[PDB]
Amino acid sequence: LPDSVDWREKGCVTEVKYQGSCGACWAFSAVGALEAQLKLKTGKLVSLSAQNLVDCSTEKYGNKGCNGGFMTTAFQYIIDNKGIDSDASYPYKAMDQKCQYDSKYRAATCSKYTELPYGREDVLKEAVANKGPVSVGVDARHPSFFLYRSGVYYEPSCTQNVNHGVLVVGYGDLNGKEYWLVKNSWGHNFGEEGYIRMARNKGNHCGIASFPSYPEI
């Protein structure tokens, strides 16, 4: 495998989004993974509707909108629904709303998803290198995560209990300190202009490899 990967270089990553006061990280993580696949399949880079997931991938999928949800069950919604709308057609409002999906604004489909085995950072590396960005959960329940500005993030109090959905868009090392390149949805002023580099091959740090998944179109 390559020593480093950055899917932004390959035209497969959209602008960083801002979730605001709504806990829709799971929805942003899901759409980000699918956006990359859509680019690979069709050649178009298009922001997909996180709001569509918040509003429509709800109780039937075990999700709770602005109170949290699962990337995997979001993918299954898109499969079952035979589509997800563009962000442009179904923009983000940072609140729970009635489902407004319309197939006339469909921007992508999903045929399946794959959940990687628990805790295996080598398998996660392979998927990022060979398949695309991968949706993951991390333990973000520590002040240092909120305060993060730059460099490789390591939090000695981190656990493998994940609570925040993000997107692994690459990996590498900073003067030998290995990291995962993570796209967050806390806007362009969080961390490294919306990104955080999290410790890699440090014992599944913050549960980054606990629950990884990726969709296919």
Ligand SMILES: *C(=O)[C@H](CC)NC(=O)c1cccc(C(F)(F)F)c1Cl
């Ligand atoms: C982040 O915006 C929201 C805040 C409620 N967090 C989640 O949706 C969430 C909560 C528990 C576990 C997960 C997991 F495992 F899917 F990552 C998530 Cl995304």
